[PDB]
């Protein structure tokens, strides 16, 4: 729904006299802020366990920063989404420097290719593929060849002015 941050959200299923110290369930939620993070936490906990916001509590919320924000990684992403006619599971691969950037790319890509809005997508799993040759999508694999170089043909520079006096060039 915006530029994403990843939050660990831990909730409780609030204690009673019968059950003190309940079982402290945790989730990694990609959300643009903490209100949405906690909302998504309760949404998925209600999908998983007999609990709701009114019968539980948020024990903790903590943003998780990328441990290595400046190393390029290949992420495998497993999602579950609703199409116009059904629900489907999908696996994709995204090359980027952080989980939040990978997830933002994934949401953009789901919207672009499957018209799957945010509300229709569940992030099942995001995991860095530590070993290349376990990358199984060609659109990522092509970026892992040795000494990868490519030109950027047909450069289009934007003019600051309405009129130009030169009949410009697209060389690069």
């Amino acid at each position: 729904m915006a530029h994403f941050k990843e939050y660990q959200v831990i909730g409780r299923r609030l204690p009673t006299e019968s059950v003190p110290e309940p079982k402290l369930f945790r989730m990694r939620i990609f959300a643009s802020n903490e209100v949405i993070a906690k909302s998504r936490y309760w949404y998925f906990l209600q999908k998983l366990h007999k609990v709701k916001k009114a019968s539980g509590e948020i024990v903790s919320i903590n943003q998780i920063n990328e441990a290595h924000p400046t190393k390029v990684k290949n992420f495998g992403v497993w999602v579950r989404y609703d199409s116009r006619s059904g629900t489907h599971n999908m696996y994709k691969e995204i090359r980027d420097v952080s989980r939040v950037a990978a997830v933002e790319t994934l949401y953009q890509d789901m919207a672009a290719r499957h018209r799957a809005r945010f509300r229709s997508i569940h992030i099942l799993k995001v995991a860095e593929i530590e070993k290349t040759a376990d990358v199984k999508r060609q659109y990522v694999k092509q970026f892992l060849t040795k000494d990868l170089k490519f030109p950027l043909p047909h450069r289009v520079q934007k003019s600051t002015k309405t009129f130009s006096y030169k009949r410009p060039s697209t060389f690069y």
């Binding site: 003019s159 309405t162 009129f163 006096y165 009949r167 410009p168 697209t170």
Partner: protein, 197 residues
Amino acid sequence: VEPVVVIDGKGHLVGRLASVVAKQLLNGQKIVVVRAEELNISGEFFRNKLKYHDFLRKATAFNKTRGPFHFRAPSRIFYKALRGMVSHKTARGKAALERLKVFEGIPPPYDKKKRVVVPQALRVLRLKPGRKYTTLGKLSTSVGWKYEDVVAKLEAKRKVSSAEYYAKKRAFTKKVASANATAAESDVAKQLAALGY
């Protein structure tokens, strides 16, 4: 910035060019468009010919001389786009349209004047490579414009004359750049360079 801005319409994406020119006209700038026959429309030639035929079938049923006139010349097709994007039924829009001239080719007054382009309307900068596009001269010939050959002949003549002019100008520019090459290590030139010139 100039009193008259002369746009070389060659390869200029008629709709985007018309947007630029309409805004300039309404802002108060005099615009002269040349080489309207070399303008481009995105989409296949057959697409644009079918579009113009759909335009051509529209006419006042009880008197065709009252209905929308279908001007075949490339300059008048560009003018149709531009008029549709100017509020042409008001006095302000009439003044704006009076600030405009469109031509096929480059007629004598403007053949010796500077021509500019509009990068935000240029086909090579705007269209994705591989996309098909139409040339207004070909579209106009196909829909009844009678003067593509005459315009091409006059343009070949003008280009011969202009290439001769440019050979002379390039020779003189080489002379000037050589005389500026010397006196580049002079004290005045070094002070100019210190000041950025």
